[PDB]
Amino acid sequence: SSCFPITLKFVDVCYRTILSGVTGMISPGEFMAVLGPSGSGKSTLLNAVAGRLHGSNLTGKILINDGKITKQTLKRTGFVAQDDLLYPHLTVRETLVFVALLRLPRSLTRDVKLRAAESVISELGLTKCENTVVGNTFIRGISGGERKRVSIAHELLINPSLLVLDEPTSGLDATAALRLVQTLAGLAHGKGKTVVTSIHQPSSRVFQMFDTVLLLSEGKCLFVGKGRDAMAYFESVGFSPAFPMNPADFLLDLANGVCQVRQTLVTAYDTLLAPQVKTCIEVGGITTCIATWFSQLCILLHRLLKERRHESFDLLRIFQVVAASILCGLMWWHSDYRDVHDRLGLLFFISIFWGVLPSFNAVFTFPQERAIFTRERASGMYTLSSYFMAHVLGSLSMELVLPASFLTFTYWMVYLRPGIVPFLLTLSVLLLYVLASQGLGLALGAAIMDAKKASTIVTVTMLAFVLTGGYYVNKVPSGMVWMKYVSTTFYCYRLLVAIQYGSGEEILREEEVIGDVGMWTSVGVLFLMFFGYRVLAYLALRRIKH
Amino acid sequence: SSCFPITLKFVDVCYRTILSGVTGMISPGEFMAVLGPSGSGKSTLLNAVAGRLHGSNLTGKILINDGKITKQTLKRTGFVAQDDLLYPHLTVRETLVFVALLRLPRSLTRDVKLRAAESVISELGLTKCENTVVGNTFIRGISGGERKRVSIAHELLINPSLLVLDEPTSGLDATAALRLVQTLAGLAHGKGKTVVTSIHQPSSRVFQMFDTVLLLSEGKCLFVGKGRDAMAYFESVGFSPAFPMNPADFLLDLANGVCQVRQTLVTAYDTLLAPQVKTCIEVGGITTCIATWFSQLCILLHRLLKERRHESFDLLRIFQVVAASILCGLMWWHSDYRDVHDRLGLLFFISIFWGVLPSFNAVFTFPQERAIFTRERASGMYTLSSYFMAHVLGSLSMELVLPASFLTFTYWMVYLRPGIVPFLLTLSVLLLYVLASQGLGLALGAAIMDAKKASTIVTVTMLAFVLTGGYYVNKVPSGMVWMKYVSTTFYCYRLLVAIQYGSGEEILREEEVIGDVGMWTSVGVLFLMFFGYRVLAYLALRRIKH
């Protein structure tokens, strides 16, 4: 792999000071480690050499193969970050299949996009756990050193020629962190890539696997050399250990003061190594762009299918609906339609329960997956308009199966109106109201992007929708009668009474409670709240500038 | 300190195998490290040598100063565990003052119990942050290496002569984990104590601070010696490194296979070191016991005072009560008492809101602090009956200030009955109902001890209390009329109507809604649910056998 070499030179990097004159070169086929104490800015060097600091404070010359950070050579570079962002309910094989269908170019087949995702599984040693779910801290999945190899496989699908990693071995074991360094040395030696990593606290034989070492001590680097003459260099200045110790622990003490002194390391670097490195340092149309959109939406629906039915079918949401079905069928068992005060309280309990329950569970959707979206939209996998519509279409399928089972169990126990026409009109109003209540939660969760702070604002909003719905207060004090024309509970409840009683005179053989609004101007407003709360959630997610 | 030495011998420990013949002795004034791979059972050795495995599977001779694990010599032993259990809202000084008032003996003054808690602060180096709050991951407090010194200070108040620690330096920094080992070597050398610790992955100069080393490789130990002749012993068998490396990394490779082989280490141990260690291995009344109880309750009230007002006065619970006060004063503004259907809906909204809101927030109390309670009750600081009554008395003070401010703002806006006698009877019924609704949440949170699983059972229970309360369903189908005699919402709502309308005939100048239950048999049942739900929470916490 990678028969197209690369050479990375970063002459005089200065970031504002964090970095103050870092200079070195990275030949193709080398495995380099950036060593430094926690604060020297060894994470800032990796981002500003992979093209993540966009020339604002970065005053240096990051030139890639005697060039620049032009986008033609930036698609040959992968940056593996420090935290892992994976979906739990996908297995290891189908994690890397949906990523290969989104990242690899559109002018291929589906044949060599599945053989490009199984040549990456059986190269990082993931062929044992490929049918095991990924999981998280709450789902029994895969181990944390084998969870890191899925993040590295996510970057090797596009076949990069420069791989930049940010603390791979961190939290891993003693022997899991050695086999990971042994494959990263197998990429740089066997394939011919160029790996630049930053190891925090290496070990006695992890330091033997390295090839070149960079030592940062708050800005100015102290040593750039081939990783086994590091201990023979500092004894020429006059620094040497006493007790037998790790060669990586002797260097990380010279980086912060403790010797066996910090200022003479900086002066001796600019007189013997910096003259040595800097002499060598110069020598489709319209039909294409629509079918690309619908394929981004069909992959993102199947990729998120297992996540949506984890939200809407756990056993603590089924138990709240089975309980409310039994308590309604036992309180209003074989109810009579001639006592109007009881049946109007049945029809208002349905409006409270199915407006509070869809709106509350919808404010957790977008703040839960924000780091996953902003990492993957910035990497060119998908846009916002196809990510968003895969949540709109995928949530109006799973959220319409518990209210449809509530009503079937309950409709002929409590003796509502008999017939197939009053039953299918009562189900249609109930499912339109669940979709209008859900979009109010999606609009408040996206505008605020905090799940605990928006959970109390949907409480206060839905408390005012119930009180102005038309059941508790029979006469409203004349500066509050405007308030019922914005609530979803008012328009649902006037439609349920119009189906069960009609115009009103059929029971007259209690008139302000069977009053007049209109049956076509109540379904017309529940569609304006269906479409209108989904548009205000798109515009609230458009504001997040990456 | 510790002018009463101790000598720990643990001849032939075998635990069922985890441990299979561990044998050694620990002289007074030594700092010993137990080294081993993750799985060798170096945590099981520390618990079974501090007296935490109670002779069931532990088939060995744990003898302490040629004795046994009799309770007279077990109060001279401190075991610092691995995770830290601290209250966040207490500062560092008053954390160690409440612990000193509970652990030190009762036959002292309060003078030398505060000078015994400030000679521990200015000995572990906590005199800089003594006025800084402890915090957690969510509150900005103190650093995680300085959070560990508060756990060690918790065990040095009783002045032990054997201190046993379980991975102290874990998650700490490179230089924070060196200064912690330097004070633990200052206890064993300067004072004269006996420190036995188990370090996971030590460093190059952390290994120089040790004095004796124990090396466990799955059961049978491989080396017991004075920590600087460890590398000169294995080269006499014929094992030696090649590249320069940490002496703790060479040993932890011989413990699992990897050499520069595992079975010849076990045989060579039982022929040269085991004959060497085993030749030396033999040569008040009634007024006292009540005032002790009331002092445990006065300390535990002030210790938990800052935690109770974090629960009941955050800005997301104040915003739900200010919103409901405004929505009630605007919907029923200057209401009239002659339209009875509106005022009965005002009095039923108060019963729903103040039964759902106290019961929901009470199921989080006991599962939140279970590891703190079971650690500290087992250590002899307090019992269950004084820990429990400090939550009962401390929660009926802070939970009666938001419903008392709700009613004062609202009572003369919505024009309920004028006078000081109908106002103080309406406040008294509302505060008795809040205390009865709270105990139902405490009983369900303690029986289940899971905050998410009990949060849906208080939902289903309080949904059935509302529907059988007496407002929605006017006639109940004759097998469900028993169900209203167990709900708290029924007994509160019949008392509010009896204060605002009375016997009923005063408005008769709508009779099943101003019916008959009794005003003394409704306050008598709200006290039986006050006391009865608190007794069922004590019996549900009594079942947890440590």
DSSP characters for B368-421?
Answer: HSSHHHHHHHHTTS--HHHHHHHHHHHHHHHTTSHHHHHHHHHTTTTT---SHH
CA distance A459 to B323: 10
**Binding-site residues of B:** 36-43
Residue A231: exposure state from Cβ atoms within 10 A (0-12, 13-18, ≥19): middle
SS3 B508: coil
3-state SS track over A394-432: HHHHHCCCHHHHHHHHHCCCCCCCCCHHHHHHHHHHHHH
Residue that terminates a domain, selected from B283, B315, B333? B283
The angle subtended at Cα A447 by Cα A444 and Cα A452, nearest 5°, is: 60
Tell me, yes or no, if A334 comes closer than 8 A to chain B by beta carbon.
Answer: yes
Here the contacts of B185-192 (C-beta below 8 Å, separation 24 or greater) are B185/B31, B185/B209, B185/B211, B187/B163, B188/B29, B188/B30, B188/B31, B189/B29, B189/B31, B191/B1, B191/B2, B192/B1, B192/B2, B192/B3, B192/B5, B192/B28, B192/B29
SS3 B31: strand
SS3 B344: helix
Q: Per DSSP, what are the bridge partners of residue A91?
A: A133
Tell me, yes or no, if B545 comes closer than 8 A to chain A by beta carbon.
Answer: no
Do residue A315 and residue A456 come from a single domain? Answer: yes
Q: CATH code at B253?
A: 3.40.50.300
Tell me, yes or no, if A333 comes closer than 8 A to chain B by beta carbon.
Answer: yes
DSSP of B123-158, one letter per residue? TTT-SSSTTSB---SSS----TTTSHHHHHHTTSSS
Which strand ranges, in their side-by-side order, compose the sheet holding B25-26? B25-26, B8-11, B61-64
Is-contact A102 A110, C-beta < 8 A? Answer: no
Interface test with A, best of B200, B204, B361, B476 (most A CBs within 10 A): B204
Do residue B525 and residue B415 come from a single domain? Answer: yes
Q: Which of A210, A228, A257 is nearest to A39 (CA)?
A: A257
How many other C-beta atoms can be found within 10 angstroms of the C-beta atom of residue A538?
16
CA distance A272 to A177: 34
Contact B331 A480 (CB under 8 A): yes
SS3 B165: strand
Q: Which of B37, B173, B467 sits opposite A327 (nearest CB)?
A: B467
Interface test with A, best of B320, B473, B481, B489 (most A CBs within 10 A): B473
CA distance A332 to B245: 80
Structure tokens at B341: 């259907």
Q: Which of B85, B63, B56, B9 is nearest to B379 (CA)?
A: B85
Question: At B424, which helix (H) or strand (E)?
Answer: helix B420-448
Residue B378: exposure state from Cβ atoms within 10 A (0-12, 13-18, ≥19): exposed
Tell me which DSSP letter residue A190 carries: I
Residue that terminates a domain, selected from A131, A159, A187? A159
Here the contacts of B469-472 (C-beta below 8 Å, separation 24 or greater) are B469/B348, B469/B351, B469/B493, B470/B494, B470/B513, B471/B344, B471/B345, B471/B348, B472/A331, B472/A342, B472/A345, B472/A349
Do residue A356 and residue A503 come from a single domain? Answer: yes
Calculate the CA A94 to chain-centre distance: 17
Contact B246 A243 (CB under 8 A): no
CA distance B397 to B352: 22
Is-contact B159 B78, C-beta < 8 A? Answer: no
Do residue A461 and residue A318 come from a single domain? Answer: yes
CA distance B472 to B459: 18
DSSP of A2-68, one letter per residue? --S---EEEETEEE---EEEE--EE-TT-EEEEE--TTS-HHHHHHTTTT-S-SSS--SEEEESSS-
Residue with tokens 């959220």: A399
Q: How far is A77 from chain B (nearest CA, A)?
A: 32
B499 within domain boundaries? yes
Do residue B447 and residue B528 come from a single domain? Answer: yes
B209 within domain boundaries? yes
CA distance A443 to A516: 31
Tell me, yes or no, if B240 comes closer than 8 A to chain A by beta carbon.
Answer: no
Strands B19-22 and B13-15 come out as antiparallel
Question: At B9, which helix (H) or strand (E)?
Answer: strand B8-11
Calculate the CA B438 to chain-centre distance: 21
CA distance B362 to B360: 6
CA distance B495 to B469: 12
Q: Which of B320, B475, B480 sits opposite A456 (nearest CB)?
A: B320
Do residue B139 and residue B249 come from a single domain? Answer: no
Calculate the CA A391 to chain-centre distance: 13
- By residue count, chain B amounts to 546
Residue of A nearest to B458 (CA): A320
Calculate the CA B258 to chain-centre distance: 42
CA distance A115 to A108: 12
Residue B172 zone, left/alpha/beta (φ > 0; ψ -120 to 50; rest): beta
Residue with tokens 């535990």: B300
Which strand ranges, in their side-by-side order, compose the sheet holding A25-26? A25-26, A8-11, A61-64
Q: Which of B244, B330, B476 sits opposite A480 (nearest CB)?
A: B330
Contact A477 B330 (CB under 8 A): yes
Q: Which of A245, A319, A467 sits opposite B246 (nearest CB)?
A: A245
Tell me, yes or no, if B520 comes closer than 8 A to chain A by beta carbon.
Answer: no
Q: Which residue type occupies A101?
A: L
A204 within domain boundaries? no
How many other C-beta atoms can be found within 10 angstroms of the C-beta atom of residue A418?
9
Q: Which residues of A touch B252 (CB under 8 A)?
A: 174
Tell me, yes or no, if A319 comes closer than 8 A to chain B by beta carbon.
Answer: yes
- Euclidean distance between the first and the last CA atom of chain B, given in angstroms as a whole number: 32
Do residue B142 and residue B176 come from a single domain? Answer: no
Tell me, yes or no, if B423 comes closer than 8 A to chain A by beta carbon.
Answer: no
Is-contact A158 A103, C-beta < 8 A? Answer: yes
SS3 B180: helix
CA distance A322 to A338: 28
CB pairs under 8 A between A and B: 124
Residue A86: exposure state from Cβ atoms within 10 A (0-12, 13-18, ≥19): middle
Q: Which of B311, B269, B481, B292 is nearest to B402 (CA)?
A: B311
Question: A534 CB contacts (<8 Å, ≥6 apart)?
Answer: A392, A439, A442, A443
Q: How far is CA A216 from CA A24, A32, B172, in A?
A: 12, 13, 21
The angle subtended at Cα A437 by Cα A540 and Cα A365, nearest 5°, is: 50
Q: Which residues of A touch B339 (CB under 8 A)?
A: 474-475
CA distance A299 to A447: 27
B359 within domain boundaries? yes
Q: How far is CA A267 from CA A60, A219, A222, A460, in A?
A: 21, 13, 9, 65
Do residue B313 and residue B428 come from a single domain? Answer: yes
Q: Which of B84, B65, B83 is nearest to B162 (CA)?
A: B65
B546 within domain boundaries? no
SS3 B221: strand
Residue A75 sits at φ, ψ, to 5 deg, of -85, 5
Strands A8-11 and A25-26 come out as antiparallel
Structure tokens at A359: 């709106």
Question: A466 CB contacts (<8 Å, ≥6 apart)?
Answer: A352, A355, A472, A489
Do residue B103 and residue B224 come from a single domain? Answer: no
CA distance A18 to A22: 10
Q: Per DSSP, what are the bridge partners of residue B214?
A: B34, B224
Interface test with B, best of A203, A229, A331, A343 (most B CBs within 10 A): A331
Do residue B218 and residue B241 come from a single domain? Answer: yes
Q: Which of A252, A342, A473 sits opposite B331 (nearest CB)?
A: A473
B293 within domain boundaries? no
Tell me, yes or no, if B480 comes closer than 8 A to chain A by beta carbon.
Answer: yes
Contact B320 A205 (CB under 8 A): no
Q: Which of A231, A464, A473 sits opposite B332 (nearest CB)?
A: A473
Residue that terminates a domain, selected from A101, A134, A159? A159
Q: How far is B416 from chain A (nearest CA, A)?
A: 15
Strands A19-22 and A13-15 come out as antiparallel
Total domain count, chain A: 2
SS3 B14: strand
Q: How far is B321 from chain A (nearest CA, A)?
A: 10
Q: Which of A245, A324, A460 sits opposite B463 (nearest CB)?
A: A324
Q: Which of A382, A306, A504 is nearest to A103 (CA)?
A: A382
Q: Which of A173, A327, A475 sits opposite B463 (nearest CB)?
A: A327
Q: Which of A339, A131, A344 is nearest to B472 (CA)?
A: A344
Residue B209 sits at φ, ψ, to 5 deg, of -75, -15
CA distance A140 to A121: 21
DSSP of B34-84, one letter per residue? EE--TTS-HHHHHHTTTT-S-SSS--SEEEESSS---HHHHTTEEEE-SS-
Is-contact A247 A234, C-beta < 8 A? Answer: no
B477 within domain boundaries? yes
Is-contact A389 A296, C-beta < 8 A? Answer: no
DSSP of A461-483, one letter per residue? HHHHHHHTSSSS-SS--SSSTTG
Q: Which residue type occupies B157?
A: L
Method for this entry = cryo-EM
Do residue B411 and residue B360 come from a single domain? Answer: yes
Residue A291 sits at φ, ψ, to 5 deg, of -70, -20
Question: B533 CB contacts (<8 Å, ≥6 apart)?
Answer: B436, B439, B440, B442, B443
Tell me, yes or no, if A418 comes closer than 8 A to chain B by beta carbon.
Answer: no
Q: How far is A482 from chain B (nearest CA, A)?
A: 12
Q: Per DSSP, what are the bridge partners of residue B212?
A: B32
Residue of A nearest to B463 (CA): A324
3-state SS track over A192-243: CCCEEECCCCCCCCCCCCCCEEEEECCCCEEEEECCCCCHHHHHHHCCCCCC
Is-contact A364 A454, C-beta < 8 A? Answer: no
In chain A, residues 284-303 whose CB comes closer than 8 Å to chain B? none
**Binding-site residues of B for ATP:** 36-43
Question: B182 CB contacts (<8 Å, ≥6 apart)?
Answer: B209
Is-contact B134 B95, C-beta < 8 A? Answer: yes
* Burial letters B197-230, b for 16+ CB under 10 A, else e: bbbbbbbbbbbbbbbbbbbbbbbbbbbbbebeeb
DSSP of B186-211, one letter per residue? HIIIII---EEE--SS--TTTTTS-S
Q: Which of A318, A344, A335 is nearest to A411 (CA)?
A: A335
Tell me, yes or no, if A472 comes closer than 8 A to chain B by beta carbon.
Answer: yes
CA distance A52 to A81: 12
Residue of A nearest to B228 (CA): A243
Q: Which residues of A touch B459 (CB under 8 A)?
A: 320
Q: Per DSSP, what are the bridge partners of residue B61?
A: B11
Tell me, yes or no, if B477 comes closer than 8 A to chain A by beta carbon.
Answer: yes
Residue B441 zone, left/alpha/beta (φ > 0; ψ -120 to 50; rest): alpha
Contact A205 B250 (CB under 8 A): no
Is-contact A429 A495, C-beta < 8 A? Answer: yes
CA distance A383 to B544: 53
Contact B250 A341 (CB under 8 A): no
B288 within domain boundaries? no
Q: Which of B546, B538, B545, B543 is nearest to B390 (CA)?
A: B538
Residue with tokens 């009329």: B481
Is-contact B541 B366, C-beta < 8 A? Answer: yes
Structural domain of residue A349, as residue ranges?
Answer: 287-541
Helix then strand count (H, E) for chain A reads: 21, 11
CA atoms within 13 A on the CB side of A217: 19
Do residue B425 and residue B317 come from a single domain? Answer: yes
Is-contact B76 B6, C-beta < 8 A? Answer: yes
Contact B331 A463 (CB under 8 A): no
How many other C-beta atoms can be found within 10 angstroms of the C-beta atom of residue B104?
16
CA distance A105 to A101: 8
